[PDB]
Amino acid sequence: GGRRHTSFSSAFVYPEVDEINPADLRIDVYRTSGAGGQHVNRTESAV
Amino acid sequence: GQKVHPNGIRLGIVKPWNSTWFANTKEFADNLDSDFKVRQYLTKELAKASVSRIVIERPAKSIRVTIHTARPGIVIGKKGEDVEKLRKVVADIAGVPAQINIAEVRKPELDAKLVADSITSQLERRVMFRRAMKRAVQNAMRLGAKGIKVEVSGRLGGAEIARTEWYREGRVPLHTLRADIDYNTSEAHTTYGVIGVKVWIFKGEI
RNA sequence: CGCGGGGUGGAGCAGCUGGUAGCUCGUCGGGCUCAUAACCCGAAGGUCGUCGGUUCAAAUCCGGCCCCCGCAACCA
RNA sequence: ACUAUG
RNA sequence: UACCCGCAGAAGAAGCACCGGCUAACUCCGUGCCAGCAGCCGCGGUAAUACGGAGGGUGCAAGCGUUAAUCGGAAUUACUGGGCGUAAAGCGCACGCAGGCGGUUUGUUAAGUCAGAUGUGAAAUCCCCGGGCUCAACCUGGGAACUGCAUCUGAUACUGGCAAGCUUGAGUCUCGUAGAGGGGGGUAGAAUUCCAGGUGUAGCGGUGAAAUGCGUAGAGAUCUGGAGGAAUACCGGUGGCGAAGGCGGCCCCCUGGACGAAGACUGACGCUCAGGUGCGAAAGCGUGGGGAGCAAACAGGAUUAGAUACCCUGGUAGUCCACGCCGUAAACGAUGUCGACUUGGAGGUUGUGCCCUUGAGGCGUGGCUUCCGGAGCUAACGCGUUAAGUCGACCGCCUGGGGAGUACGGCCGCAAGGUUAAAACUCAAAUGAAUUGACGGGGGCCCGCACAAGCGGUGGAGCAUGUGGUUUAAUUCGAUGCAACGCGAAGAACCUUACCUGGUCUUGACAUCCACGGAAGUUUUCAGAGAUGAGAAUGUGCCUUCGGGAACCGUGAGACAGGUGCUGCAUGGCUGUCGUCAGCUCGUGUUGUGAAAUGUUGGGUUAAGUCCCGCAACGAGCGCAACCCUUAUCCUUUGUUGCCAGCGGUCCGGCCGGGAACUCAAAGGAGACUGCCAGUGAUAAACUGGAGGAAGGUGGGGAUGACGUCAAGUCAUCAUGGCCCUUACGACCAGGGCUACACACGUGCUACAAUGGCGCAUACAAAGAGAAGCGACCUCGCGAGAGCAAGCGGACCUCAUAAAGUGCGUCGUAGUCCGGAUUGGAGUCUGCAACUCGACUCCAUGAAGUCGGAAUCGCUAGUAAUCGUGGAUCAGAAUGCCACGGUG
C-alpha cells in the first residue's frame, strides 16, 4: 500500500551481579523396613 | 503521459513567436532579461485591462512593445495619458527609447489566456468550479470555436485531496500540427493553495 | 567408591595402528525472485575437556584432575 | 518433469 | 370552602434534550486512533458539521431526557397474509390403519348453513347524541354496542345423514405385444493368475527419468497340457424395465408389473396419509465357505525443503457365495403423491386401426421417453402439456450466520453408530442469481531482439565514477524493484555550500514606507585570520513660485524582512512509467426490473478500433494515419569568402587572367499515389509478383506520448495552503568537510597481447566552437609549455597533423619490446591560493592481469564491433553526457 504504520519495541536494561550448618540440622537415625533376615531387623542404616 | 506544449511544437508552422528580434551572443542574454522585465511589469500593471499577449520586437536600438488586449480603452486611458506613462518606465527597464502600441481582441471568449484569466478570477471569489468551466465552454462554442477543452486541477471546492475535472466540447486535435490550437494557462491563488487552469481552443486548420 | 566406556568447528558424528582432521546440517559472501523460503555458485571456521608426562614429534601412547553416561553394590 | 508463502 | 370584589407593582415564576445519516437543526477553538462518542452504520491517527468547550440553531416545554417493559413497525410464524429446483425448506421409496377430502341423479331428513322471534349477555369501560363543572381533564342523562350462548318458528341452493339409482373415476374377465423386472438351477467362450512340461538366451519389468522387484538356480518371449476364481467384449443405443435402491453372455424352471385392441362385467368400491409395517447403493459387522484379478491398512523404491501423499514394486481386510444385521448417500430431476385445464416443432421407443400393403411406404390412434422453444411464470438463471404455467385434495418441511444435526435424555443396534433433538455464548451479517473487471500451472487467434539463429560484452584484474554501509567535528540535502545507483550536479581546491569548528551582526546580506544628516564617488592608513573596527581629500549631475527635491550613502525606532526549515500523504507547474501499446469513450436509439449491454462483436485484411463486407444499431470524439524536421534523385534561381570542366599564362599552389559548366551553399519547385501490368481473392478491402524508377508498398531517421495507472518523483529551480524559527533554524567571515575506508553492489574505462606491440614514412572525413575569445608564422624548451605577434565576430583566420588504414623495418609466445596500476625525483600551466584536493609533461619504478564461478546485458544494417573528431558546463578540472564522420 504505503500506509502509516505504528510499531512498538521494548528496551529492557538489567545490571549483573555475582554450606548448610550442622547446628541447623537434626539427624534422626533408625531401622529400615523390608527384606533380608537378621541384618535388616537389627542395624540402623536409615537416616 | 505528459503532453508537449501545444504552442511550442507549432512555432514556425502556424504560431509565430512573441519576442521577434535578432541578436548575436554578446547581447542575447541581456535582451532576454530586459524582455522578461518589460513583460513582468506590464502583466502587473494591466491586470484589469485583460491582456492576451505582449509581443516585443527590437528594430535599430529601440524597443517596440505591441500589446493585445480585450479592453483598448483602459490601457489607452484618456488621450493616452496611460500609454505615455507606460513608455517612460518601460524605457528605463529596456534602457533604450521605447514605443507602445495596442491591438484589440474582438472575441475575448476565444483567447486562451483571457478565458483562463476569467475562470481563474471566478475561482478566487469562491464560485463553484463546475459552473465556471462550463460557462466558458458554452461561450466559445456559440461564437464558433471548432472546439475547446478546459482543465482545472487541485483542491476543488476546498477538498482535502486534489483532483482534475476537465470538460471538452467539439473537436480538439493536438497531434495535428496544421491545427491552430490556441493554448494557455493560469494559477488561481486561493485559501486552499493553488488551482491551475489549462485551456485549449481549436479554431480550424492551416 | 568396584569395573568399563565417552568429552573433536556452532549442532550431531567420523579420525584414536603415534608423523596427514573429515561427513551431513548450521554460519558468512555472491546470485535467482517484486520479496522471502527452496534451489545454484564461492569462502571461512576445530586450544581435539583440563593439567602433566613420554617421544625428535601427541587428537592419537601413559598418568592425575573435572564433568558425563552404563554395569555392579550380593549370602545372611 | 515442474511446485511453498506474502 | 367554591365563587365574587378591592389594593400594590412587570413586579414573585424556564429549563431539558438534540444539531454525521436515519432525523428537524452548523460554525469556530481545543484534542490528535489519546481522551472520548455510539441505538445501527460508524466518528477520532494535526484543518473532526460525529469527541470536549464556545457561539448560533432545531425540538419539546414546568417539564425534558436515560433505562426497563408491552404491542407496533415485522407480510420476520403469513386465519386475514409467506414459502420449499439453486437463497432455510419435498421424508431414500412404497404400502397402509385412525384422520382430512370425495363423481353424477331423484327422493327424504333438516345436523352444518341462512332468516325471523323471544330469553339472557351485571353496572362501570368503549363508541354516538346531549347535559353539568368559566374551558378542559373529570362527572353525568339517553342510546348504540356486548360480533356470544340457548329456546322457538320458517328456508332447503350448498355440505352432511338415510334410502334408491347411474357410468364417465376406480376395478374384474377375454386376447395379444415388448422388456438388463425379480427368485432358483444349469451351461458357453475370451482373458488374467498359478502349476507341470517342450523350444530358447540375456535381459525383463517399470517410469517423466529411475530404483525397489523378477532373471544364467534359465527370466521375459513362444508352444502344449492342467487347475481355479471372478466378470460377461461385439450387440449397446440422451435404447429398455423396475416404487425407489437398481437390473446386461446363452438355456430351463418358479414369478411380479406395464401397455394395447374390441367387447362384456361390478357400480364411486375413490384420492391422500400422522403414528405403524415393509423395501432400501457402497462401505461396515456376525457365523461358515471361497479367494483368480483388484485392492483400504502395511512394506520397500522414487519424487520432495519435508512427502506420514500423488508415481512405482509388492500386499492383508474387503470385493465373491450362503444365512443374519446395519438403515445410511450430491439415496439428485437437489423438483411429495393424485386429478383437471392451457400455442408449437424436431426426434426416439413400443402397441394398434384404415390404405393400386404395390417399396424399406400413404392416412390416423394409444403408452413411455430425448432435445428445442411460445404464452405465462420466475430474483434471475431458467421451467416451459413429462411445468417451475392456471386451479383443486391430502401430506412432509422452513423461519439470520456460527454453536450444531452437536450435548443431554429416550428408542434401535453385536459394534460402528443411527434416529429423535436443545441451550448458553458469539457476529451483523451469512446466502442466492446475474454484471463489470482482474486473475488462472483454462482454451483460441496475433504481436515484440521475447525466444530461436548469430556477433559482441558484464560477472574475475587495475583504474574512473555513483550508491550502501562504516567512519567522522562534519562526511550537506534529495533520487531506492522494473521506472534509484557516471541519477539532481551541462563539471565541490576558495567560490559553489546547503554541512562542521571558531570568530562576529541583530529592522538585519536582500525590499518597501517615514524621520533626520550628507551630492554620488575618489584615496592611502595601522590593527585583525578575515568579517570588521580608528584616518587625508572632493565636487554640487539638476532644476529652484529657492523649501530643498531627485541620483546615491550612513544613522534612527517600528510595520517588517529573512528561512536550501517540516509536510510531494494539502497543492500548482514540470517529469518518469505501462507504451508509439491500439486502444479509450460519448451522444441518440435499442435490449435488460437493474448493475450493465450493444455500438467497440462476427468474416476478411492491416503496422494500426487500418480498411471493406456484414450485423439494433446510427453517428461523434480522443488516439492510429497524415500535416512538421532530416536524409535519398532531379529541375529553377543565385555565384563569394565556395567551385575549376573548357581557355591563356605560371614561382607548378585555383595561384592570376578569366569561366558560371561541375561539386558545394540555401531559397523556390518536381518526384511515389498500390499510379501502371499480371495473378490470388465474396465482382470488396487488400495481398503475392512484375515493370519503369534515385527511391516501392508507412523508402531510412527523428519530433509527435489517448483515457488513465503507481497518494510514482520533485515544497532543494520556481510557485504555493498550513505548521514552524525571528538577538536565530536568519546574516557575515576564515579554516575544515562534501575527496574519509575493514567492506558490499551498480555503471564505465584499460587490459591480459601477434587480427598484435614499438620505430620510420604516407593517404582519405564529418560535424562543431571562437573577442575578459580562438590564437598562426618565426624564436627558445627533451616535453608540458614559454617569448614575440599576423589574422579572424569568422564558407575568408584560428582551434586542427583525424585515427583506424597503407608500405618498410623490428619483436617470437616470454608475465615478454604484452600490461600500465603504484611509488620516488624534477617540472609546466590556470588560479589570491593546488597541504588537505586540479590537470598535463619529463626521468625512474613496472602491481594485478595468461579471456573470468553461479548468473547476466546489448543488437536485425550503414546496425553490432572497432577507430578517431567536436561541443555544452568551465579560470583550471571528462574514462561521464550530448553530437560528428571513418572502417564495417
PDB file of C-alpha atoms (C1' of nucleotides) in Angstrom, chain E residues 669-853:
ATOM      1  C1'   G E 669       9.596  23.712 -57.185  1.00  0.00           C
ATOM      2  C1'   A E 670       9.116  18.429 -59.301  1.00  0.00           C
ATOM      3  C1'   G E 671       9.012  13.192 -57.547  1.00  0.00           C
ATOM      4  C1'   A E 672       5.865   7.724 -55.183  1.00  0.00           C
ATOM      5  C1'   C E 673      -0.028   7.634 -55.068  1.00  0.00           C
ATOM      6  C1'   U E 674      -0.662   0.492 -54.839  1.00  0.00           C
ATOM      7  C1'   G E 675      -0.302   5.352 -60.011  1.00  0.00           C
ATOM      8  C1'   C E 676       0.534   1.162 -64.220  1.00  0.00           C
ATOM      9  C1'   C E 677       0.815  -4.695 -65.689  1.00  0.00           C
ATOM     10  C1'   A E 678      -0.311  -9.794 -64.320  1.00  0.00           C
ATOM     11  C1'   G E 679      -2.277 -13.331 -60.984  1.00  0.00           C
ATOM     12  C1'   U E 680      -4.800 -14.622 -55.973  1.00  0.00           C
ATOM     13  C1'   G E 681      -9.498 -13.022 -53.538  1.00  0.00           C
ATOM     14  C1'   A E 682     -17.156 -12.837 -51.658  1.00  0.00           C
ATOM     15  C1'   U E 683     -17.120  -8.508 -58.535  1.00  0.00           C
ATOM     16  C1'   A E 684     -14.896  -5.890 -51.585  1.00  0.00           C
ATOM     17  C1'   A E 685     -10.937  -4.302 -48.773  1.00  0.00           C
ATOM     18  C1'   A E 686      -6.446  -5.986 -49.541  1.00  0.00           C
ATOM     19  C1'   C E 687      -2.445  -9.425 -50.717  1.00  0.00           C
ATOM     20  C1'   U E 688       1.893 -12.007 -53.881  1.00  0.00           C
ATOM     21  C1'   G E 689       4.802 -10.941 -58.084  1.00  0.00           C
ATOM     22  C1'   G E 690       6.417  -7.698 -62.222  1.00  0.00           C
ATOM     23  C1'   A E 691       7.789  -3.163 -64.888  1.00  0.00           C
ATOM     24  C1'   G E 692       9.747   1.602 -65.146  1.00  0.00           C
ATOM     25  C1'   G E 693      12.111   4.475 -61.218  1.00  0.00           C
ATOM     26  C1'   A E 694      17.336   7.701 -57.483  1.00  0.00           C
ATOM     27  C1'   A E 695      13.649   5.571 -54.063  1.00  0.00           C
ATOM     28  C1'   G E 696       8.065   0.758 -53.845  1.00  0.00           C
ATOM     29  C1'   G E 697       4.221  -0.679 -50.875  1.00  0.00           C
ATOM     30  C1'   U E 698       4.481   3.855 -43.599  1.00  0.00           C
ATOM     31  C1'   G E 699      11.966   4.143 -48.736  1.00  0.00           C
ATOM     32  C1'   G E 700      15.527   5.333 -43.719  1.00  0.00           C
ATOM     33  C1'   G E 701      15.782   8.506 -39.173  1.00  0.00           C
ATOM     34  C1'   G E 702      13.602  11.921 -35.757  1.00  0.00           C
ATOM     35  C1'   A E 703       9.701  15.125 -33.436  1.00  0.00           C
ATOM     36  C1'   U E 704       4.711  13.798 -32.123  1.00  0.00           C
ATOM     37  C1'   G E 705       3.151  10.007 -25.874  1.00  0.00           C
ATOM     38  C1'   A E 706      -5.060   8.832 -25.912  1.00  0.00           C
ATOM     39  C1'   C E 707      -8.379   7.918 -21.254  1.00  0.00           C
ATOM     40  C1'   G E 708      -5.768   6.700 -17.468  1.00  0.00           C
ATOM     41  C1'   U E 709      -2.054   3.661 -13.867  1.00  0.00           C
ATOM     42  C1'   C E 710       1.606   3.830  -9.368  1.00  0.00           C
ATOM     43  C1'   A E 711      -1.233   9.033  -2.667  1.00  0.00           C
ATOM     44  C1'   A E 712       5.446   7.109  -8.626  1.00  0.00           C
ATOM     45  C1'   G E 713       9.303  11.752  -8.494  1.00  0.00           C
ATOM     46  C1'   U E 714      10.290  16.809  -7.164  1.00  0.00           C
ATOM     47  C1'   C E 715       7.985  22.166  -1.222  1.00  0.00           C
ATOM     48  C1'   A E 716      16.319  21.925  -2.633  1.00  0.00           C
ATOM     49  C1'   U E 717      14.737  25.550  -9.656  1.00  0.00           C
ATOM     50  C1'   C E 718      10.267  28.159  -9.276  1.00  0.00           C
ATOM     51  C1'   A E 719       5.313  28.960  -7.197  1.00  0.00           C
ATOM     52  C1'   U E 720       2.234  27.725  -3.109  1.00  0.00           C
ATOM     53  C1'   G E 721      -2.067  26.186   1.717  1.00  0.00           C
ATOM     54  C1'   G E 722      -0.820  25.129   6.520  1.00  0.00           C
ATOM     55  C1'   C E 723       2.860  24.401  10.646  1.00  0.00           C
ATOM     56  C1'   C E 724       7.221  26.271  12.460  1.00  0.00           C
ATOM     57  C1'   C E 725      12.191  29.853  13.761  1.00  0.00           C
ATOM     58  C1'   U E 726      12.725  35.553  14.308  1.00  0.00           C
ATOM     59  C1'   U E 727      19.292  38.608  19.408  1.00  0.00           C
ATOM     60  C1'   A E 728      18.197  32.681  15.486  1.00  0.00           C
ATOM     61  C1'   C E 729      16.643  27.315  12.257  1.00  0.00           C
ATOM     62  C1'   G E 730      18.004  34.459   9.959  1.00  0.00           C
ATOM     63  C1'   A E 731      23.047  37.129   8.394  1.00  0.00           C
ATOM     64  C1'   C E 732      28.793  37.956   7.592  1.00  0.00           C
ATOM     65  C1'   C E 733      33.782  35.809   7.681  1.00  0.00           C
ATOM     66  C1'   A E 734      38.451  32.393   7.898  1.00  0.00           C
ATOM     67  C1'   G E 735      39.746  27.297   8.170  1.00  0.00           C
ATOM     68  C1'   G E 736      37.869  22.374   7.534  1.00  0.00           C
ATOM     69  C1'   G E 737      34.212  18.941   5.097  1.00  0.00           C
ATOM     70  C1'   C E 738      31.072  17.114   0.745  1.00  0.00           C
ATOM     71  C1'   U E 739      37.515  13.623  -1.841  1.00  0.00           C
ATOM     72  C1'   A E 740      37.136   9.896   4.686  1.00  0.00           C
ATOM     73  C1'   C E 741      37.809   3.483   4.042  1.00  0.00           C
ATOM     74  C1'   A E 742      37.525  -3.345   7.267  1.00  0.00           C
ATOM     75  C1'   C E 743      33.861  -3.741   3.485  1.00  0.00           C
ATOM     76  C1'   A E 744      29.187  -4.899  -0.392  1.00  0.00           C
ATOM     77  C1'   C E 745      26.667  -3.512  -5.043  1.00  0.00           C
ATOM     78  C1'   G E 746      25.826  -0.516  -9.815  1.00  0.00           C
ATOM     79  C1'   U E 747      27.644   1.900 -14.366  1.00  0.00           C
ATOM     80  C1'   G E 748      32.005   2.677 -17.169  1.00  0.00           C
ATOM     81  C1'   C E 749      37.498   2.852 -18.984  1.00  0.00           C
ATOM     82  C1'   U E 750      42.180  -0.022 -19.681  1.00  0.00           C
ATOM     83  C1'   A E 751      43.949  -4.656 -20.179  1.00  0.00           C
ATOM     84  C1'   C E 752      45.570  -9.815 -20.430  1.00  0.00           C
ATOM     85  C1'   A E 753      48.639  -9.386 -26.445  1.00  0.00           C
ATOM     86  C1'   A E 754      50.944 -11.345 -32.996  1.00  0.00           C
ATOM     87  C1'   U E 755      43.590  -9.924 -36.488  1.00  0.00           C
ATOM     88  C1'   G E 756      49.156  -7.746 -32.224  1.00  0.00           C
ATOM     89  C1'   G E 757      53.483  -4.094 -29.631  1.00  0.00           C
ATOM     90  C1'   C E 758      57.427  -0.464 -30.861  1.00  0.00           C
ATOM     91  C1'   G E 759      60.149   2.623 -34.645  1.00  0.00           C
ATOM     92  C1'   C E 760      60.246   5.422 -39.738  1.00  0.00           C
ATOM     93  C1'   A E 761      57.491   7.216 -43.875  1.00  0.00           C
ATOM     94  C1'   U E 762      52.453   8.043 -46.174  1.00  0.00           C
ATOM     95  C1'   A E 763      46.782   8.619 -47.549  1.00  0.00           C
ATOM     96  C1'   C E 764      41.121   9.555 -47.193  1.00  0.00           C
ATOM     97  C1'   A E 765      36.401  12.747 -43.003  1.00  0.00           C
ATOM     98  C1'   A E 766      32.411  14.970 -40.968  1.00  0.00           C
ATOM     99  C1'   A E 767      30.300  17.919 -37.740  1.00  0.00           C
ATOM    100  C1'   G E 768      31.184  21.863 -34.462  1.00  0.00           C
ATOM    101  C1'   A E 769      33.439  26.385 -31.418  1.00  0.00           C
ATOM    102  C1'   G E 770      35.793  31.309 -31.106  1.00  0.00           C
ATOM    103  C1'   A E 771      36.512  38.744 -28.607  1.00  0.00           C
ATOM    104  C1'   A E 772      37.979  39.343 -20.391  1.00  0.00           C
ATOM    105  C1'   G E 773      37.904  34.682 -27.067  1.00  0.00           C
ATOM    106  C1'   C E 774      40.401  31.371 -30.839  1.00  0.00           C
ATOM    107  C1'   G E 775      45.450  32.333 -31.408  1.00  0.00           C
ATOM    108  C1'   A E 776      49.052  31.233 -36.825  1.00  0.00           C
ATOM    109  C1'   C E 777      54.261  32.239 -38.616  1.00  0.00           C
ATOM    110  C1'   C E 778      59.051  32.590 -36.596  1.00  0.00           C
ATOM    111  C1'   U E 779      62.383  32.049 -31.981  1.00  0.00           C
ATOM    112  C1'   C E 780      63.562  29.291 -27.109  1.00  0.00           C
ATOM    113  C1'   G E 781      62.465  24.263 -24.385  1.00  0.00           C
ATOM    114  C1'   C E 782      63.574  16.594 -24.464  1.00  0.00           C
ATOM    115  C1'   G E 783      58.304  17.749 -23.304  1.00  0.00           C
ATOM    116  C1'   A E 784      54.063  20.053 -20.691  1.00  0.00           C
ATOM    117  C1'   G E 785      54.812  24.809 -22.343  1.00  0.00           C
ATOM    118  C1'   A E 786      57.223  29.926 -22.825  1.00  0.00           C
ATOM    119  C1'   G E 787      58.528  34.615 -25.687  1.00  0.00           C
ATOM    120  C1'   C E 788      57.132  37.601 -29.852  1.00  0.00           C
ATOM    121  C1'   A E 789      52.790  38.503 -32.933  1.00  0.00           C
ATOM    122  C1'   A E 790      49.746  38.495 -38.010  1.00  0.00           C
ATOM    123  C1'   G E 791      44.712  37.150 -38.904  1.00  0.00           C
ATOM    124  C1'   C E 792      39.736  36.404 -37.577  1.00  0.00           C
ATOM    125  C1'   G E 793      32.660  38.283 -34.754  1.00  0.00           C
ATOM    126  C1'   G E 794      34.671  34.391 -38.969  1.00  0.00           C
ATOM    127  C1'   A E 795      32.346  29.083 -46.237  1.00  0.00           C
ATOM    128  C1'   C E 796      37.994  34.096 -45.708  1.00  0.00           C
ATOM    129  C1'   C E 797      41.572  33.488 -39.988  1.00  0.00           C
ATOM    130  C1'   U E 798      42.455  30.048 -35.618  1.00  0.00           C
ATOM    131  C1'   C E 799      41.403  25.660 -32.631  1.00  0.00           C
ATOM    132  C1'   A E 800      43.314  21.393 -36.301  1.00  0.00           C
ATOM    133  C1'   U E 801      48.615  16.924 -38.275  1.00  0.00           C
ATOM    134  C1'   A E 802      41.814  12.715 -37.987  1.00  0.00           C
ATOM    135  C1'   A E 803      42.796   7.773 -36.249  1.00  0.00           C
ATOM    136  C1'   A E 804      41.971   3.063 -37.532  1.00  0.00           C
ATOM    137  C1'   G E 805      44.350   2.283 -42.843  1.00  0.00           C
ATOM    138  C1'   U E 806      48.724   1.532 -46.059  1.00  0.00           C
ATOM    139  C1'   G E 807      54.197   0.426 -47.079  1.00  0.00           C
ATOM    140  C1'   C E 808      59.035  -0.681 -44.901  1.00  0.00           C
ATOM    141  C1'   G E 809      61.793  -2.311 -40.717  1.00  0.00           C
ATOM    142  C1'   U E 810      61.642  -4.967 -35.864  1.00  0.00           C
ATOM    143  C1'   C E 811      59.901  -8.141 -31.580  1.00  0.00           C
ATOM    144  C1'   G E 812      58.925 -14.517 -31.489  1.00  0.00           C
ATOM    145  C1'   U E 813      54.736 -16.761 -27.376  1.00  0.00           C
ATOM    146  C1'   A E 814      58.101 -14.933 -22.717  1.00  0.00           C
ATOM    147  C1'   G E 815      54.130 -12.030 -17.116  1.00  0.00           C
ATOM    148  C1'   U E 816      57.582 -10.544 -22.681  1.00  0.00           C
ATOM    149  C1'   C E 817      59.791  -4.626 -26.644  1.00  0.00           C
ATOM    150  C1'   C E 818      52.155  -7.547 -23.672  1.00  0.00           C
ATOM    151  C1'   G E 819      50.093  -4.546 -19.419  1.00  0.00           C
ATOM    152  C1'   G E 820      50.110   0.052 -17.324  1.00  0.00           C
ATOM    153  C1'   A E 821      48.450   0.375 -11.678  1.00  0.00           C
ATOM    154  C1'   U E 822      51.506   2.172  -7.704  1.00  0.00           C
ATOM    155  C1'   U E 823      55.501   4.960  -5.559  1.00  0.00           C
ATOM    156  C1'   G E 824      60.234   8.432  -5.807  1.00  0.00           C
ATOM    157  C1'   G E 825      62.535  12.523  -8.203  1.00  0.00           C
ATOM    158  C1'   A E 826      62.194  17.008 -11.229  1.00  0.00           C
ATOM    159  C1'   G E 827      58.936  20.413 -13.788  1.00  0.00           C
ATOM    160  C1'   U E 828      54.665  23.133 -16.600  1.00  0.00           C
ATOM    161  C1'   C E 829      50.030  25.844 -16.610  1.00  0.00           C
ATOM    162  C1'   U E 830      45.220  28.040 -14.543  1.00  0.00           C
ATOM    163  C1'   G E 831      44.210  30.422 -10.292  1.00  0.00           C
ATOM    164  C1'   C E 832      44.689  35.464  -4.208  1.00  0.00           C
ATOM    165  C1'   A E 833      45.794  30.281  -3.292  1.00  0.00           C
ATOM    166  C1'   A E 834      46.969  23.376  -5.958  1.00  0.00           C
ATOM    167  C1'   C E 835      48.792  20.661   2.061  1.00  0.00           C
ATOM    168  C1'   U E 836      44.179  18.601   2.817  1.00  0.00           C
ATOM    169  C1'   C E 837      42.117  18.002  -3.011  1.00  0.00           C
ATOM    170  C1'   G E 838      43.499  20.084 -10.083  1.00  0.00           C
ATOM    171  C1'   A E 839      45.184  18.755 -14.806  1.00  0.00           C
ATOM    172  C1'   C E 840      49.302  17.939 -18.060  1.00  0.00           C
ATOM    173  C1'   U E 841      54.907  16.909 -19.007  1.00  0.00           C
ATOM    174  C1'   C E 842      59.811  14.601 -18.292  1.00  0.00           C
ATOM    175  C1'   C E 843      63.270  10.609 -15.685  1.00  0.00           C
ATOM    176  C1'   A E 844      62.983   6.497 -12.830  1.00  0.00           C
ATOM    177  C1'   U E 845      59.671   2.326 -10.608  1.00  0.00           C
ATOM    178  C1'   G E 846      56.870  -1.808 -13.706  1.00  0.00           C
ATOM    179  C1'   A E 847      51.261  -4.398  -9.100  1.00  0.00           C
ATOM    180  C1'   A E 848      47.147  -7.324 -10.694  1.00  0.00           C
ATOM    181  C1'   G E 849      46.192  -9.432 -15.027  1.00  0.00           C
ATOM    182  C1'   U E 850      47.564 -15.518 -19.463  1.00  0.00           C
ATOM    183  C1'   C E 851      39.901 -14.184 -21.681  1.00  0.00           C
ATOM    184  C1'   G E 852      36.887 -14.546 -15.888  1.00  0.00           C
ATOM    185  C1'   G E 853      32.029 -19.466 -10.933  1.00  0.00           C
TER     186        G E 853
END
